[PDB]
Amino acid sequence: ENPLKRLLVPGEEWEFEVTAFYRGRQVFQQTISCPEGLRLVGSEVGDRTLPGWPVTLPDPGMSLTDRGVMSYVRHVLSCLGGGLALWRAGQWLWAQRLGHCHTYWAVSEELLPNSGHGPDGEVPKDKEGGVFDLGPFIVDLITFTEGSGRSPRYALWFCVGESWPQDQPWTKRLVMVKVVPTCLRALVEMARVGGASSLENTVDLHISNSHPLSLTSDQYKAYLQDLVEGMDF
């Protein structure tokens, strides 16, 4: 009855879009759906026994042009070990660092990882750490539909093997990974177009067992409010 509640139903799988950048250049993109989430890894062998879908970041390639720089990328990748794990449980996203690369994270904009205020945290190794709560996200999204606040951020950016580029151009970092749970992207775009009129617009939530929805803003905001009332704060 509330289509958005499909987001949190037992057995649900979200799609996550992984985009990797080596020194400010997009080198890889893959979309994952898996109940155990995903692991950002370096090689396609060595660890094949861990839960979570392996997302192998590509070898930097061997060119006469930038081999000094890419050599560093290659070493970083080779130290990923079990990887950087990311998964969902209920309304929360969790991450854990299973290899040797110290990894910092922040929730930020699609195009700019480091808006200046520094990392939200370092991904823990010996315990999982919460990196996202859909509860506050949806509160902020409703505020956005009411024009009382900016578009909520949903892009998880990870800096791998180096300190967070606080007050530094992010493109200088060897390995930067953006992870977007694409449902959140879709929810924001829906609010964005919904503010332009009261005509119906289509949303694909990009989650398991969910066909596209065609809602007016009034209906969407109604569903958002019903959703957030059943969420944990």
Partner: peptide
């Protein structure tokens, strides 16, 4: 200019190492 890698396991700085030779 050079990146400074934050990777655990990289073995202590040469001064913090016992010289057994």
């Amino acid at each position: 200019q050079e990146p400074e890698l934050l990777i655990s396991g990289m073995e202590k700085p040469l001064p913090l190492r016992t010289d057994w030779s």
